[PDB]
């Protein structure tokens, strides 16, 4: 059992240390993974510290306890969805086109055009933007309340779709040397490939140069 993975009840707080939670970033207004580092006495007694999943490198920090919540874990479908639910969704607001951040948000509006198309627009709550287009439906998050089942990375990683690809367009048909193999471009065998923590790019076990008997770091870097 790793010790990052067990969860610790420290004898008080709503949310445990080691606990998967979403943190809300102040100066942005939109949510991201972090976990509960430790949980302190000095709503108003205990105080919570996290880390950022995705941003080690800004260490620890005090959250307070209105801007902690549950790590986001269910996709609504969009029959689940109704007009006036506050959920969790992508937008990006200084470029409605493309992928941007995770902010809650009111439903406005909900039309299903087509078998293919649908219309979703919310109120965005940094202050609040209205009439907002989100083109990511497919990934509807429901918002996570105090007392949910407490979550720890032996759960899973509960990682969302952070990143905007240019190349393969995230198709799983087409090849790609820039979000897969970089030797071959095959996506074939994500178990027999690993991947890289400082720059992020992948290689198979029998194309490195020398080959790996078996399944981490790159070697180009070292
Ligand atoms: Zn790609
Ligand atoms: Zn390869
Ligand atoms: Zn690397």
Redesign the pocket.
Same mark, same amino acid.
């Given at each position: 059992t790793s010790a990052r993975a067990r969860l610790i009840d420290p004898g008080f707080g709503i949310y445990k240390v080691n606990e998967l939670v979403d943190a809300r970033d102040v100066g942005l207004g939109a949510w991201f993974e972090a976990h509960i580092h430790s949980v302190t006495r000095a709503d108003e007694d205990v105080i919570y510290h996290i880390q950022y999943d995705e941003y080690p490198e800004s260490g620890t920090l005090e959250m307070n306890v209105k801007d902690l919540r549950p790590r986001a874990r269910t996709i609504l479908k969009w029959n689940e969805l109704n007009v006036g639910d506050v959920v969790m969704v992508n937008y990006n607001v200084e470029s409605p086109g493309q992928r941007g951040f995770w902010f809650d948000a009111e439903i406005t509006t909900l039309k299903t055009i087509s078998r293919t198309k649908k219309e979703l627009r919310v109120k965005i709550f940094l202050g609040t933007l209205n009439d907002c287009k989100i083109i990511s439906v497919d990934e509807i998050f429901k918002i996570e309340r105090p007392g949910a089942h407490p979550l720890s990375f032996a759960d899973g990683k509960f990682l969302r779709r952070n990143d905007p690809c240019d190349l393969c367009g995230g198709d799983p048909e087409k090849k790609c040397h820039s979000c897969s %193999?970089?030797? %071959?471009?095959?996506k074939h065998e994500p178990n027999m490939?690993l991947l890289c923590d400082e720059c992020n790019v992948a &290689?198979?076990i &029998?194309?490195l140069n020398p080959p790996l008997d078996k399944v981490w770091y790159c070697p180009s870097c070292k």
């Open positions: %193999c970089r030797v %071959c471009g095959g490939q &290689y198979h &029998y194309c």
